Design a protein around this nucleic acid. Structure first.
Length: 55
DNA sequence: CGAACCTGGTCTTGACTCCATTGCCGGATTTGTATTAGACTGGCAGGGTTGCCCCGAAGCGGGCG
């Protein structure tokens, strides 16, 4: 149904005084990774650092 | 009245000496930074009370047809 959808949409778009709730809503966007993605990203980091050292 | 003296601050000099002032050096202690490789991935005061001000339905009366 869409009644629970509009209920969750109305309850999710509520403003409060807690900044930590906004921070958790902020950090809840990007999903977690796996070890091969971590290896690939660290490869990219070290390669970019060697490239800017070459620069 | 003239001479010798006693004692007043007054002041120099030679010697002693004593304690602050750096100063170095060695060590003790004290404070500041870097590092720990299994994996671990989204919380909690909190409401309740009292009083006053700002926007929305609603009669509703006047303009409209």
């Amino acid at each position: 149904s869409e009644a629970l959808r509009q209920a969750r949409k109305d309850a999710e778009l509520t403003a409060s005084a807690d900044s930590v709730r906004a921070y958790l809503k902020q950090i809840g966007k990007v999903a977690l990774l796996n070890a091969e993605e971590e290896v690939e990203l660290a490869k990219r980091i070290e390669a970019g650092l060697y490239a800017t050292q070459l620069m």
